[PDB]
Design a protein around this ligand. Sequence first.
Ligand SMILES: C=CCn1c(=O)c2cnc(Nc3ccc(N4CCN(C)CC4)c(F)c3)nc2n1-c1cccc(C(C)(C)O)n1
Ligand SMILES: [Cl-]
Length: 261
Amino acid sequence: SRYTTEFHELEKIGSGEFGSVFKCVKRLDGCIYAIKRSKKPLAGSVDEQNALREVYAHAVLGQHSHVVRYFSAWAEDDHMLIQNEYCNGGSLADAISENYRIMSYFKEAELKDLLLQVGRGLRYIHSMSLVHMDIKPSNIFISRTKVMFKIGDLGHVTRISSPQVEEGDSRFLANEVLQENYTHLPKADIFALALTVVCAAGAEPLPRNGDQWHEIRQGRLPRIPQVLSQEFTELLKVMIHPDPERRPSAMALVKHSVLLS
Ligand SMILES: C=CCn1c(=O)c2cnc(Nc3ccc(N4CCN(C)CC4)c(F)c3)nc2n1-c1cccc(C(C)(C)O)n1
Ligand SMILES: [Cl-]
């Protein structure tokens, strides 16, 4: 087995209906990688389509400092394996959970740093005529150097041009995508990034549906318990503007005065 041959398992760092993720050291270079191991999906299925989006997204993207680097992908023994960069800080979701446990928080400055860094990742992805379509804390990963935020889980990535949309988490989904309007998909990533930052900011668990879900798509923010400048607030507000054309592009976002730097 190539997996056992090329790598030594150190620890399981993830599990679910996607299979498992392992922290592994590669014997040859002594470096650490996150390897996802999963049952090879049924030919022609959803998870196969989702899985191929991931492979063919790397084929295009290459390498960027705010996107989790992809090294290789293979299949064997009726499983598929994908070898990615290992980010020692876990995901933003883990960090948010840890913040509540020990009762710390991300300073307003650190919220802005998060927004800029992920924003840079998004600008790169969008420049390659791709959209991520599943931005949320659990898909943002952290490397501690003094910190790098990196976009991961490319399983929903689709083309801007000929988009094949597997809808992302309902909690971070812009209404126009739910309305099968795919004419401005980059702006959906922006919408989801705003709510991601609001989660980091200490806001309550986002609604999956119902009234409060709609109230957000009406362009109003969840309550943030920290003291954020009225202008950082206004940046986040316009990022969930009902009209996705009023939302800034990724490139407009990373050049914003509020975030420099
Ligand atoms: C290759 C699979 C995708 N993926 C990466 O590319 C990837 C890159 N880096 C890390 N770093 C990392 C993730 C999680 C912990 N843990 C915190 C919770 N526990 C306390 C244990 C440690 C940690 F320490 C480091 N993780 C990565 N991935 C990962 C891991 C788990 C689940 C998922 C899913 C649900 C598929 O998105 N992904
Ligand atoms: Cl657009």
